Structures are given as structure tokens and as C-alpha cells.
């Protein structure tokens, strides 16, 4: 089409390294401007795509993010800069990552980091808490809660250090019939 | 030394593709492309000529393919559609609307194939004609309406039963002359045209569900999953659908993750109990043989409706209209059933699929039945019917898609106005009569619509295999049937977000995703049985359609086989396909099948034996 | 049969008219964007 | 209250079983039996008196069933025969004869079969024949010889081809009467048995290989994960063969291993193959060439003596003398060949194997062919070769049959004299005039002999294959062939023993157990069509029974379900057996298929898994 | 079946105990009898089946073992009190382990035994090196034999302790579709 | 052509003295224990 506010070349190389279309790209940038005309510019020839930035409750408004419990996680997984801010980059990483033709594998990876909130690489008992208490609005008694982490638990406990790697995640919700059709985010 | 650069150059290319999916920042995917695209250029060190042009090929090639699959994103419909189906209620409701988009695609597939191969063949011959012309002379009998017919034409009951004008079109198989072919040299025979692309398209459809259903298993997705161990992880690590915009679907997820847990912790493995013995299995016992009873009920109805004449307003239409009503009311009956079977909802709702799959398949197989019998009664008859005997004597070919369009046309307008009824004016019915009412019509019966994807899923499969079972007699079918499929899509679509509310929870009959597909290769079988028995057996209409006077379906083949190649080939074939060839195939694959169940058998209690030790 | 031919068929023109009615309701409702059933909220709120 | 109790004693009696397969000396064994039945005699407060007395006889059925098998276990041949050539060979060679024994033990239930069904109700109704009696009045024609055959019967010529008194006896296909039954009421007709008799074994044949190679896969060996990660681990602890007896055969064990382990060590590209530029290849190619030329001649030499007449000594057995010189000489000449291919062993092998199959196959049809030519001929004759129509018309079944029949007798003579001359002669040769010769027979060539494990089995495979191929014909074939494979066992085990030597190195093409299984099904398979054909297409003979002047071989069933079920459903079966619902049949197996080996594929893999994880 | 050598309650308690049938437990009876018929009494009542022992040089002079490299093995891992004796029950318990019928568990347990010379429950560098040795008669290098251990090691050590515990010598050998077939001695 | 003798045909008499020869020969055969072929420390010396 058109693509004036991309160069061909950012363009080829933004699909040649995500899993969008021109055509996707176009409209996420519109979806991005949308959120904020005044900091997002008309044209972003050049370095502008990873420059400009929205805060974090500029981009949960939006209605892909707003009932999600873990938008804030999903924010600050995905930005690169720890600031507070997510760039036009990371947006369209994070939009690449929940879309459909996104692989199994970068998906478990991205759900682990996401759901790994004190970001140590590990699925700890506090981290399954939070998560819990989070999916069920805390109206599960602290009894329940804990039994269900229990549970959690000691599946995947391999090594037996009571907590859940990457490895032992990845090979347990790989095998969950229906992950792939939850964690998907569709734009 | 020399292949060091080949291992370089392969490395690189297999990194730049393995780049687009790694958990990396844009930043560092750019650079890693970067660096990748220059050691492309540093190949240099390359041999010319061959290699040269093989990588100058390869990258033309990739690219054409990028950009073909740009201009290919444009052409997919209803994205933002079900973008704002699937924010508003879900992954599962908007799985059905992803399905309907998938059929409608495969039918514009055999819509195209049966335009390019059959029907735009027999318009060119058409248009082509002249009158008083040789084709013209030859095909007067079954082109050209006669004046009775032309005087009649525009009566509301010959467009009721689709003759007049739409029997002497392209529509239906009469139309189509047996003396069409478009070879100087190599004929384009239009009748063998016909036949195989009939053939082709059963066997298209049935290649494209499985490579579908393959690609949905594996090569794209996870293709496991055959333990229970992982319970409490699959229902904490999947508890939330990432797909939910509303927030009321929002807050019935919470609610349904609670009532998960509760369960889980408390119900699933601490506390099985029972409260009237020997009471609920009387009344599940009675509901059963009720059920029975509609099913039956329904088989007496359907024939008796086929015996019904007198060419009135509904006498025409009785048996669309029966066969419509029990289509769109049993699944209700058999869910208020189901309410009062106390019946677990999980198991309650595969009840309810085998149940309307069963009055399906009944229904189906009792229409083929009543028409069949319709036909040998109007047949023998022989020696309104002025109509019917137009074309040169007694399509039945013709009357059989008929009957099969009217089906279809039927099902349509009785689906618009069960969704106008039950959806809309019930919805508008709870919504300002609630208050009036002596009990609460929002919180007791009837409370407000629910899109049953599985229901729906079920229809829209009875009618792609309607389709499949008319094809052959109405090589148009799909076409009309194209219509029906983008209205059907629209008016659910439109009940969805103006009538219908989120289920409180989604207790799904099949842990699989290609559950719908396996649907339609059930049916898609079903279909292509009875058409197979027609054209084995049954004898075309003398003076009508593509085969006309001729002996057997397959006989024009047949003939262009003898004529064309020598005797002994020939024989070798009809030898080839005798019974006694294909019967031992048959009974070694029964009892491959039987040893194979026994096999799998014994490592599925082996898996549950080695799950149980832990 | 009805009285059926005023130049055209009567079915005909009844057909003609339902058509444009057709049109004209479903371009109404493509425009219109309405949402009959209730939020939870609603139904809970006014059940005192 | 009670439950625990009899969970206790239910895990008790599960230990009771699973002693026998403990890693524990015999007082542990001992202590532990001893202390369980204790447990269980000595619970106080049993279950009822009905279901006490159920558990008596559960403990009455468990020691019957040890006593029938330590009553069997007396019944199983040559354990000491195998157990001497295992010990002195290996478990590769006596698998062969274990493969023997199987082989035999299913012809013999094939013959138990045949005898109580069809053999023994016919010699009852002859022995209960008398002279003038209403059963000899019409069986005269094809039980009692006119005097020109009587006469003849003792020349030499009729013996050869089976034309004197095997001919009129329970042999062959035409001496059966059609009138032959038993009771007044619900009659057994003897040509119904013989029919049902020969579908029947036919099906229970593929059932018993299939239930083979089901338990033989239960057995543990299904659990290879087919790959090659586990190279020098199966090399290194599967390396010995424990049922090694003779030191030659440990040496060459012991050099064998030397041989794998270096060569595993110097594979993987640490030695790069290389060969002569362009010879081998060519070479290769001029082979495969020649043995496409050998396998032309072989079927133009069926077809040449097939058309050979006379009565001279070798003119009756002109066809089965050729194919079983072809049969046994060929593989030789494959074999040889194998040296100029230089390929690698194991390939070299399967190659051979792959050969020496596709000879038998192209040898059954060319005989198939043969036997259909001479057999039109024949019936083209008429409008000592005459005197075979002294039975009453061509009986062409009893001609196929005496044809089959001399095929497996010339078999059985002519793998005598070559097991006499190619082993036991060459050996004598090569062991005593070896201080004369120039070449050194032992050394260089030829050795003493190699049993060929695997030609071996492609031989008992064909002649099985023939066996079931004239079986229809020649009811007591497989009884005879008893006779045959007994006397091949014996002398294949001298064989064995006085003339073979050990293998320098053994190499198996398939590496599974159940390969020879799979060799006797495809086999099996090919055969079954031939006569399914003939069944269904073939009109039977008009005087010699069971099926004289029948419409078809399947008349007489049809005829019995008519006279049954006169019900239209017996049409409504011929509707089901047809073409145009066959074929939906036969595609909804080929999907369904796959389906399952999938599914087992993943229920291993997942199987796997589990084991992993503990 | 006579029944005169052995009691009925023997013969049942041993059925019991073992795969083999009455007739198979005569003819090891006669067997064993005729290694030395001096010392083995020709009647077996009672206790004497689980006392009378041969030496192991009087067992490997039978056909069935003279040849095996492992037959020193075999003899000590299935002597029960060891001591340079093996008795009529660890003779059937030898025979029965190496019969057709014996489950491929037990016969993976027997396997892991012999080849444990050192007896710590786990197949180390040493054994694999004596395990060699015997397979090829010494002809192999100090080089190969210690290359082709380390191989075997990579292969089967995924707990990186430099040794073959019993499970991953049962995950490895399960696999193997040759060791039914020569873990076997017919008698 | 072979003729009849008394009582008795040519080939019979052939086949009855060829069975009893072959019987004979079997029985012996499975007396003698013979082993033909050499092994490899009896085929070494033949250097000398
Ligand atoms: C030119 C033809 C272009 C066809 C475009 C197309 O393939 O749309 C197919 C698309 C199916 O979607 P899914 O396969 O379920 O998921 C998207 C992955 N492709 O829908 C259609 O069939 C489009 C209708 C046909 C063309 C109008
Ligand atoms: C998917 C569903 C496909 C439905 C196919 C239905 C079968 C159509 C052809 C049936 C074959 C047939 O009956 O005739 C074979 C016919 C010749 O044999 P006959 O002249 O009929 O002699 C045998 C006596 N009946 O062969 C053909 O030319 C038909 C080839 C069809 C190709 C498919
Ligand atoms: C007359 C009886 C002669 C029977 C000879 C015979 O059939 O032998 C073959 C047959 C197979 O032997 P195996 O290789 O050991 O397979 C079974 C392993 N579970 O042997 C038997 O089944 C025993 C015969 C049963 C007696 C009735
Ligand atoms: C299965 C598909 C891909 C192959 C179908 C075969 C079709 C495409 C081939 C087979 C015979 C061909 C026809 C043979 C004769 C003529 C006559 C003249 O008008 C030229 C085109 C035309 C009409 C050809 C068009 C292409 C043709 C119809
Ligand atoms: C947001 C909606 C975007 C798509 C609008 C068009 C909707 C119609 C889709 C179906 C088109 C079918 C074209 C082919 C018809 C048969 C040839
Ligand atoms: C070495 C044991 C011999 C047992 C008898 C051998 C003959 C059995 C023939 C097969 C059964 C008939
Ligand atoms: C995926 C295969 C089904 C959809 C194909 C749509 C093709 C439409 C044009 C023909
Ligand atoms: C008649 C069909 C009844 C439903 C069949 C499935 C029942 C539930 C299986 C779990
Ligand atoms: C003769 C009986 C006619 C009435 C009953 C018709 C039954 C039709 C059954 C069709 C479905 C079969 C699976
Ligand atoms: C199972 C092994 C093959 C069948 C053995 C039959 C033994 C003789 C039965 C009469
Ligand atoms: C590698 C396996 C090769 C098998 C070849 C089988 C056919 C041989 C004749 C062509
Ligand atoms: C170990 C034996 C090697 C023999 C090599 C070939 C010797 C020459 C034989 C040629 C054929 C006989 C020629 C006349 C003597
Ligand atoms: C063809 O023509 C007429 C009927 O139209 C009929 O007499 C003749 O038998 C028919 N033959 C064939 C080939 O069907
Ligand atoms: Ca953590
Ligand atoms: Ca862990
Ligand atoms: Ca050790
Ligand atoms: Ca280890």
C-alpha cells in the first residue's frame, strides 16, 4: 500500500524479524498513535520507532489490556527499558509474541517470564500466590491458596528445589491441551 | 577448507531464519540481522555460475513468496469481525466463527473448481449456440422451456419448488447436454468433466479436512497431552483466556476459576456422595427412552410429511419444513432433558452432542429414504407432474437436487427466524417484560441467550453435508450455498453481540481442536456413501442431464476407456475392480484395527498403571 | 390462487416491498450498534 | 469396614503372582510365599458362603490350568533338537527353527480343521455308503473309477501326476459329493463346511500371525525408541550371545566384536569411503541390469515349459522341476553377484532378501498365469491327458490341485538333493580333495557352508504360501505338507549339525522380531487373492462336487440365505456387498488407520516419558 | 511325571517360585546330578535341595557356561551364601533368570548384577574396562577400550557421575532389540 | 517302459528297494554323530 510512515526498509526488516504483514504493521502504528497523538509523530522514518514511548497506563487503557490482570506484567516484560515506558518496539514484539502464528516455544518462554513476577527465572511459591490470588480475585481462603500452590508444586519438583524452572514449566504446560488458544492476543 | 564457507553461509541462513521467533528484544533481533546479512555479503568467497544463480534464484523466490503473502492478508474477511466476537466473549465462541470462515473458504474452493471445470464450460457451449443450429437442434429438448412452462414460470408455486426458470438454468443437472464437448483434436468432454470433477471434489474435500486437521494436530501446535497428572497446572498456567475485552467475560472467568479450584481442592478428590438412590437412575432411565421416542417420532414425521401432497403453499415445502423444525427444537428438548437428568455438565454436554448428532444422521438417512421412495411411487405412477415431465420425461436427477435446494433454502430462512425468535424477541422479552412477569425471566427460565457454539458447529456441518449429498445433482449448489454461508456468518455474528450473553462457564465437550473437523469428516463420509450407491446402481434418466441415455453413471468413462485404449487393458480393469479383490483387503484391515485396539489398549492401562504408582 | 396480476405478479410486488423493507432494517441495524441484554450489574442492582 | 480387609488380601494375592519374577534368592522367595498364603488361609470373617464358593473354584480353575500346562509342556517337539543347534550356532540360526516349529504347529491346527470339518464328515458318509444305495447311485460318477483308470492307475506316469487313486480319494477337490449333509433337520451340508472352512482358515490364519506378532511385541522388544543414540551401548552389553555352546562360534563371536567396535570406532566419517572412480558403479549397474534378465527368463521359462506337452517323464513335471531348480539356484547367483556389487554387508543382504522375495512373488503369478493358460487350453481341447476326463468333465479345481500338489512334492525332493549335494557333497569335497586342488576349496571358495537363515525362511514362506493357495483345491494339502515340513526339519537340522559351519559375522536385514511374521502375512496376503478371484469370477465345474454346475463358488450360500432369510434383507446384504459401498468403506479404514498408528506411536512415546520421569 | 525325586508340596512351592513346570525342575534336578553325581544324594525331600552345593569349577565345566566369558559372574551373583557354592535353588534361580520366559525387568536387574564386578551397585569405569577386555579377548588398544568407554558413558551417565546407575542402564538397554535374544541360556 | 513282473510293476520294486535303502541309510545316519566340516585351529596347519 501506501507506507509513508515507514521506509521500505524498516518495513522488510521489521517483517523479516517479526511475524506481521505490512499490512499489520500499518495498523499496529495506527493503534499506537491512537493511543497518544501528541507524543506519537505522523512519521517515524528512521530511529523514531524504538525513541518514541508511552507510559505503562497509556498502553493498559487500551481494551486488549484492560481486563487482563497481568497487563502490568505483560508491560513490563516486554519493555526494554525499565523506566516505566514501553517503546513502539516492544510493541510490536509484545503484539508478535500473543499473536496466532506465534511458536509454541517463545510463547512458554514469554508466559514464564511473565509470570515470574520477582524475575529470578523461577516459578516460586510466592510467584504461584500472587498468581492465584490474581486469576481468582483473592476469593479463595489462604488455606485453599496454599493448598493449590502444594499441588502445583510438587508437579514438575524434579530437582526438588520447590520451585519451577523454565524446563519444568516448559514441559508441563507444552502438554496442556488448550495454552496455546489462552495465551493469544488478537489485533 | 572449501566447505567451511558452505557451513558458514548455511549457518547464518538458518539464523536469519530461526530470528523471527526468538525471545529476544527488537533491538538485539535487528543487530543479529544485521551482523547475519553482512556475513551474506562476506560470502563473497563463493563460487560463480551455478551456485551463483541457485542463490540468486532462492532469493527472488523468497522474496515473490513475502510479498504474495502480503498481498494474500489483504483477501481474509471478517478479521476485525471476529477480532470484536472473540474480545467480547472469547477463544471458544470465536473458534466457531475462525470454523464458519474455513468452510466458506472451502466451499468457494469447490465453488471455483466446479465453475472453471463444469459450469462456465456449459455456459460458453451455451452462449456460443445459435438457433436452429446442430446443438441447438439437439438440446431444444432439455434448454428451451415450453410455452406451457414459460406461461407457468412465474407462478409463486413453481418458484417455491425451483422449476420454471431455475430448472431450465445451469442450477441443476438436466440442464447440462450430454453432446458438449470442446476438443478439435483431444475432446473436453463436458459430461467427463462432470463426473470426475464430482469425484475429484469429494476426494479435495476430504484431502483438505485431513491436511487441516494435520496441520491443527501437529506442525504448529503442541500434538500432546495424554496424561492427567497435570491437572492443578494445566487449570493455574491456562486459568485466564488472553482474549477477553469485556469485563463482564472478565468477571465470569474469576467466577469460573474459583468454581474450578473449589472443586479441585475440595470436590474432585474428597467427597463423592449420592442422595436418592434408585430414583435419579428412573428418572435418567425415562428420559432415555423419551429421547427414543423423539428420535422415532421424528423418522415417522419426516415419512409422513414426504407422503404428503396438495400442491399448496406447505404441501410442496411439508418436508424442508419438518425436517428444519426437528433440526432447530429437538437440541432444546433434548437440553431441558439434560436439566433434568442431573447429569454432569461435562458429560451432560457430550450427551447432548451425540444426541443432536444421532437426530442428524436419523433425519438424514430418513430423507434419502422418503426421497427415494417418492421417486419409485412417481415413477411408477408414470404408466405438478405437467412440469416434472417437461424434460423429455422424468428427471429424477432434477427432482432429487430440487428437493435437496429446497433443503437447503429452507434451512436458511427457518435458521433466520429461530435467531430472530429465540435470540432477539426473547431477548427484548426479558429485557422490558421482566418486570410485569410473576417470576423473573432474567434469573429463572428463560434466561438470556447463550451462543451454543457446538449447536451451531452441528448445523453448519448438516449443511455443508447437505451440500456434499446435492452436489452431484446441483452442480451450483455451493454457490447459493456461498450466500447462505456469508448471511449465516453476519446474522450470527449480529445475535452474538446484540442477543446474547457469555456463558457463566465452558465446560467444552472435546479436549481437541480438530473436534469440529473430525465432525466433518463424519459427515463428509455419510454423504459420499449414498452418492456412491447412486451412481453404482441406479440408472440415469433416459432423455435428461450430462449421462442421459445412457446404461450405468460411469458407463461414459467406460466407453471413452474402451474406445480409446485396447481390449485387454480393459479387461484387466473391470477384473481389477471385481468384489473378490477388495473383500480380503477389507477383512485384513478389520482385523489389523481389532489387534492394533487390543495394542493400544494395552499401553493406555499401562500408562494408567505407571501414572497410578507415581 | 390469488389475485394474482396487477401488470406484475402480486407476489412479485409483495416480495419487492419486504426486500426494500429488508434493506432498509438491516442497513438501520448495521448502523445502530444496539445491545439488548443486561450486564450482571444490572441484573443484581435492581433485584431489591 | 470390610474394604480394607479385602484390599489387604487383594494385594496379597497380587504378591502372590508377582513373586515369581522377584531379583531374590530362593529362601526370600520362599519366606515370602509362605507368609502370604498363611495371610490368606488365615482371614477370619470371609466374604458369603456364594461368593466363598466362587473363590474355591477361582483357586480350582487357577490349579487346573497349572496342571494343563505342565500336561503341555510334554507336547512341545524337539526342545532338545533346537536346544543342541542353538548351542552350537546361536539364537539367529535357531530362530529359524523355532520359526519351523510355529509354522508347523498352525498347519497342523490348519489340518485339525480341516479333517473335523470337511475331511472326516466326508469319510463318515463314504464309509456309510453302500453298494446300490441312493448316495452311491449318485456318487458313482465321481467315488467309483471306470476300469480304464483302474487299470492304469499302477503305471508310473499316473503317480507323477496324481491322476490313479489320489485322484479318486479325500485329496482332491473333485472327489467331494455336493449331496453330502448330516440330520434330518438343520442339516450339516458338507459344501457350506467346505466353504466356510476355507474363508475361515483363510481369516484365522491372519489372526493367529497377527496374535504372534502382538505377543511377540509385548514381550518388550516394542520398547526401541528407533534411534541410534545407544550405538556402542548396544554393542557392549548385548555383545555376547549366552546361548553359545561351541568354542568355534565364541571365537568368531569374539572376532566379530573386535570387528564392530573398531569399525564403530572408525566410522562417522573418521574413515571417509572411497572406492575406484566410475567402476563399482558401473559394475553395480551392469548387475542390477543382469538380474533384471535373469528374472525375464526365469518367467519366460515358466511360460515355455508351461506349454510343454506329452506324457514322458518330464513333460508332466517340466514346470515344477524348473521352478524349483529357479527357486534354488537364482539366490546362489544372487548371492555371488553380491560380491562384484561390494556393498555394505548389511545392505548387501537386504538386498539379496529383497531379490530372492520379488523372484517368488514374480514365480507364484507366472505360475498363476501358466496354470490359467493351460487350463483354457484345455478347455479348448475337447471342442494320459484324456483320462483326466474320466472324473467327469475338465475338474479343473482337481487339475490346479494336482498341479499344486506335484509343485510342493517336486519342492520337497529337490531341497533334498540340494541340501545333499550344495551341502553335505560340498563339504566331503572341500574337506578331502582340497590337498589336490589349485584353489583352496575351504579357504577361498567355496566354504563349508553358511546356513542362510533368511533364505531359509523365504523358502518354509513360499511353500506356506503355496500351501494356502491350494488349499481350496486340495483339502488334505497342508496334512501332507506336515509330512513335508517334518522331514525338512530333520534334515535341516543335520543340515545343521554335519555340513554348516558357524558365520564368520552374523547380520540381520530387519533387526525385529517379528520380520518373519511379516514375510508370512504379505505372503498370505498375495495369496488370498488369487483364489478370492476365482471364487468370485470363476464358474465351478459342472460334475465334480461340492460345487458342481454351480452358477458360482458363493451359490451355494446365497442359496442357503435365500431359502433362510427369503427377507429382502438378504438383498439388502448384496446391497451392502457392492462396489459403490465398498469403496467409502474401504477409504473410511485407510483414514481411520491412521488414525490409530498415530495414536500408539504417541502412547509410547508418551510411555516413555513416564518411564524417563521415574 | 514320576514324582518320586522331589514332594509334591516342593514341586508346587517351586512352580510357585520359579517359571519352570515339573518336568523342566526334573531334568535341571538331573542335570545338576550328573555335574557330580558323588555328592548330590539322588533323593531331594526337604531341606536337602537348599544344602547340597557344588563348587563353582564343577558348574562351569557344563556346556551351557564353559564358553561364557561371565561365567565366574554368573556363578557368584547367583550363589546365595557365595563362598565358593552354588546349591540346587541358585542353580534354578540361574537357570529360570536366563529362561525365555523371564520378563525382561528381571532379566535387566540379573544382567546389571553380573556386569557390577566391584558389587556398588553401579557400573563404573573399571568394570566396563574388564567388561571389554572379556568381550574381546584383549585385542582391542588401551586406547579404543577406553575411547568406546567413554562413549558407552556420554551415552548413558545423563546424572554426570561418571557411572551407569540401574536406571539409566534399564532406560538404555530396554531399547536395545537384541538383548532379549542373547541374554537367554536354553536348558 | 517298465513291465509288469508277477504280482508286481517294475518302478514298485524300484521304489520298495530305494525306501528300504533310504531307511536304512536314515537310521544309521542318526547313530553316527558325524561332523564334517573342519575348525579354524584344523585348517591353520595345513601351512606346513
Ligand atoms: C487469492 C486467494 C487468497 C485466499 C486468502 C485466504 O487464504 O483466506 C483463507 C481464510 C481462512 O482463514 P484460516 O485458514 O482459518 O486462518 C488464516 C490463515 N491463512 O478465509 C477464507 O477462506 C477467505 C475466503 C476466500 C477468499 C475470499
Ligand atoms: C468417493 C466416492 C467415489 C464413488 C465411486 C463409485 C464407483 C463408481 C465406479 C464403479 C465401478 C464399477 O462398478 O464399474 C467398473 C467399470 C467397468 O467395470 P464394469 O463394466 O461395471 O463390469 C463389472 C460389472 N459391474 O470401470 C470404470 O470404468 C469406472 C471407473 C471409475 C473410476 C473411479
Ligand atoms: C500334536 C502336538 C504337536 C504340537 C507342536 C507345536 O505346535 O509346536 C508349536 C507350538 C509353539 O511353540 P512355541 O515356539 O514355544 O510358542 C509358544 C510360546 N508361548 O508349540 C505349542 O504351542 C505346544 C503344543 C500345544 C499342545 C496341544
Ligand atoms: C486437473 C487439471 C489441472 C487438468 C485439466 C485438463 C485441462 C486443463 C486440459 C485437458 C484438455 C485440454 C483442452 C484440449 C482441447 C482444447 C481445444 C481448444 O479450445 C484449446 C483448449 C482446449 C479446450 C484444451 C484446454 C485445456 C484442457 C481442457
Ligand atoms: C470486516 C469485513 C471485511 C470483509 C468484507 C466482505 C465480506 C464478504 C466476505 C466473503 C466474500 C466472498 C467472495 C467470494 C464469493 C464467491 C466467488
Ligand atoms: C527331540 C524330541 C522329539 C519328539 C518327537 C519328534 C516328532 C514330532 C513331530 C511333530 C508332531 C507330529
Ligand atoms: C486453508 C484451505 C481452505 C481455505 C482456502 C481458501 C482459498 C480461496 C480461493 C480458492
Ligand atoms: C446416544 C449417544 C449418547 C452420548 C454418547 C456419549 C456419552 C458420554 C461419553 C463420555
Ligand atoms: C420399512 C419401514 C419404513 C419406516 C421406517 C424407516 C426407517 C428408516 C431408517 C433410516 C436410518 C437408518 C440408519
Ligand atoms: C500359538 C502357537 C501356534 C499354534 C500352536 C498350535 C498347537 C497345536 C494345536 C492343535
Ligand atoms: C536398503 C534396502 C534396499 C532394499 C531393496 C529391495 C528391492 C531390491 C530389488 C530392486
Ligand atoms: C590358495 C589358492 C590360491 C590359488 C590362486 C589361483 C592359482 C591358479 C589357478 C588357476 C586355475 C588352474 C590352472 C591350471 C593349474
Ligand atoms: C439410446 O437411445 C434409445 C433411447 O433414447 C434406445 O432405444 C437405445 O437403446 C439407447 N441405447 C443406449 C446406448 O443407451
Ligand atoms: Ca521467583
Ligand atoms: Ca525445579
Ligand atoms: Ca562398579
Ligand atoms: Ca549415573
Known amino acids: 500500500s501506501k507506507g509513508g510512515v515507514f521506509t521500505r526498509e524498516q518495513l522488510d526488516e521489521y517483517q523479516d524479524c517479526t511475524f506481521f504483514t505490512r499490512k499489520d504493521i500499518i495498523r499496529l502504528y495506527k493503534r499506537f498513535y491512537a493511543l497518544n497523538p501528541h507524543k506519537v509523530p505522523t512519521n517515524m522514518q528512521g530511529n523514531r520507532p524504538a525513541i518514541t514511548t508511552l507510559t505503562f497506563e497509556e498502553v493498559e487503557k487500551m481494551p486488549e489490556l484492560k481486563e487482563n490482570p497481568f497487563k502490568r506484567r505483560i508491560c513490563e516484560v516486554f519493555s526494554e527499558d525499565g523506566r516505566g515506558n514501553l517503546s513502539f518496539d516492544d510493541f510490536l514484539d509484545m503484539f508478535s509474541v500473543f499473536s496466532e502464528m506465534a511458536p509454541l516455544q517463545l510463547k512458554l518462554k514469554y508466559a514464564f517470564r511473565i509470570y515470574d513476577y520477582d524475575g529470578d527465572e523461577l516459578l516460586g511459591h510466592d510467584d504461584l500466590s500472587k498468581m492465584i490470588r490474581s486469576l481468582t480475585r483473592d476469593e479463595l481462603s489462604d488455606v485453599e491458596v496454599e493448598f493449590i500452590i502444594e499441588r502445583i508444586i510438587e508437579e514438575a519438583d524434579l530437582d526438588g528445589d520447590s520451585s519451577i524452572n523454565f524446563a519444568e514449566f516448559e514441559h508441563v504446560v507444552s502438554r496442556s491441551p488448550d495454552f496455546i488458544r489462552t495465551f493469544h492476543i488478537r489485533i | 577448507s572449501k566447505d567451511r564457507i558452505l557451513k558458514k553461509i548455511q549457518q547464518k541462513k538458518e539464523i536469519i531464519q530461526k530470528l523471527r521467533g526468538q525471545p529476544w528484544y527488537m533491538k538485539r533481533k535487528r543487530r543479529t540481522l544485521k551482523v547475519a546479512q553482512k556475513h551474506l555479503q562476506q560470502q563473497e568467497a563463493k563460487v560463480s555460475k551455478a551456485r551463483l544463480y541457485k542463490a540468486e534464484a532462492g532469493r527472488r523466490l523468497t522474496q515473490a513468496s513475502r510479498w504474495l503473502d502480503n498481498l494474500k492478508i489483504y483477501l481474509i474477511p471478517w478479521e476485525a469481525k471476529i477480532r470484536k466476537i472473540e474480545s467480547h466473549f472469547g477463544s471458544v465462541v470465536s473458534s466457531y466463527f475462525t470454523f464458519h470462515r474455513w468452510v466458506l473458504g472451502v466451499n468457494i474452493t469447490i465453488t471455483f473448481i466446479m465453475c472453471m471445470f463444469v459450469v462456465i464450460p456449459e455456459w460458453l457451449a451455451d452462449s456460443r449456440t445459435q438457433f436452429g443450429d446442430d446443438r441447438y437442434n439437439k438440446t431444444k429438448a432439455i434448454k428451451v422451456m415450453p410455452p406451457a412452462v414459460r406461461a407457468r414460470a412465474d407462478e409463486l408455486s413453481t418458484v417455491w419448488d425451483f422449476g420454471g426458470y431455475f430448472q431450465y438454468s445451469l442450477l441443476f443437472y438436466g440442464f447440462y447436454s450430454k453432446e458438449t464437448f470442446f476438443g478439435e483434436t483431444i475432446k473436453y468432454r463436458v459430461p467427463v468433466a462432470y463426473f470426475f470433477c464430482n469425484i475429484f471434489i469429494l476426494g479435495f474435500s476430504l484431502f483438505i479436512i485431513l491436511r487441516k486437521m494435520a496441520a491443527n494436530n501437529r506442525r504448529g501446535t503442541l500434538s500432546s497431552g495424554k496424561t492427567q497428572q497435570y491437572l492443578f497446572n494445566w487449570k493455574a498456567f491456562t486459568g485466564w483466556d488472553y482474549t477477553i475485552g469485556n469485563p463482564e467475560t472478565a468477571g465470569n472467568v474469576y467466577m469460573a ?212 449429498l446435492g452436489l452431484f445433482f446441483v452442480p451450483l449448489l455451493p454457490m447459493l450455498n456461498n450466500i447462505k454461508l456469508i448471511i449465516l456468518m453476519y446474522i450470527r455474528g449480529w445475535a452474538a453481540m446484540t442477543c446474547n450473553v457469555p456463558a457463566s462457564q465452558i465446560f467444552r465437550a472435546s479436549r481437541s481442536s ?76 478389520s482385523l489389523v484395527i481389532y489387534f492394533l485396539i487390543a495394542m493400544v489398549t494395552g499401553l493406555s492401562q499401562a500408562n494408567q498403571d505407571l501414572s497410578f504408582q507415581l | 390462487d390469488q389475485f394474482v396480476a396487477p401488470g406484475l405478479r402480486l407476489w412479485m410486488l409483495i416480495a419487492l416491498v419486504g426486500g426494500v423493507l429488508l434493506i432498509m432494517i438491516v442497513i438501520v441495524c448495521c448502523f445502530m450498534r444496539i445491545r439488548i441484554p443486561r450486564t450482571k450489574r444490572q441484573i443484581d442492582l435492581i433485584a431489591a
Not at chain 2, 415417522?300 to 410442496?316: N, S
Not at chain 2, 445412457?550 to 479387461?571: A, C, G, M, P, R
Open chain 2, 257 to 468: 476459576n474459583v468454581i474450578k479450584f473449589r472443586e479441585a481442592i475440595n470436590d474432585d478428590k474428597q467427597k463423592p456422595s449420592d442422595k436418592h438412590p434408585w430414583i435419579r437412575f428412573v428418572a435418567r432411565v425415562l428420559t432415555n427412552l423419551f429421547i427414543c421416542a423423539m428420535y422415532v417420532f421424528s423418522i415417522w414425521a419426516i415419512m409422513q410429511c414426504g407422503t404428503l401432497k396438495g400442491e399448496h403453499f406447505f404441501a410442496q415445502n411439508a418436508t424442508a419444513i419438518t425436517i428444519s423444525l426437528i433440526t432447530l427444537v429437538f437440541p432444546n428438548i433434548f437440553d431441558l432433558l439434560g436439566k433434568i437428568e442431573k447429569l454432569h455438565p461435562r458429560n451432560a454436554l457430550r450427551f447432548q452432542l451425540g444426541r443432536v448428532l444421532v437426530l442428524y444422521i436419523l433425519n438424514y438417512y430418513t430423507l434419502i429414504y422418503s426421497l427415494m421412495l417418492q421417486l419409485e411411487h412417481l415413477q411408477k405412477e408414470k404408466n405438478r407432474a405437467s412440469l416434472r415431465m417437461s424434460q423429455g420425461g422424468l428427471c429424477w436427477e432434477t427432482i432429487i437436487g430440487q428437493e435437496i435446494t429446497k433443503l437447503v433454502t429452507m434451512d436458511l430462512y427457518m435458521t433466520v427466524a429461530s435467531i430472530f425468535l429465540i435470540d432477539f424477541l426473547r431477548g427484548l422479552a426479558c429485557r422490558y417484560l421482566n418486570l410485569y412477569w410473576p417470576w423473573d425471566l432474567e434469573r429463572t427460565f428463560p434466561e438470556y441467550g447463550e451462543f451454543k457454539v457446538a449447536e451451531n458447529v452441528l448445523h453448519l456441518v448438516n449443511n455443508q453435508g447437505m451440500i456434499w
Open chain 2, 514 to 589: 480438530n473436534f469440529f473437523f473430525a465432525l466433518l469428516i463424519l459427515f463428509l463420509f455419510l454423504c459420499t456413501l449414498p452418492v456412491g450407491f447412486v451412481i453404482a446402481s441406479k440408472t440415469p434418466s433416459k432423455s435428461c442431464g450430462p449421462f442421459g441415455n445412457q446404461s450405468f453413471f460411469y458407463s461414459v468413462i467406460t466407453d471413452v476407456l474402451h474406445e480409446n485404449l485396447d481390449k485387454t487393458l480393459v479387461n484387466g480393469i473391470k477384473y481389477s475392480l471385481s468384489p473378490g479383490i477388495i473383500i480380503p483387503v477389507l477383512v485384513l484391515l
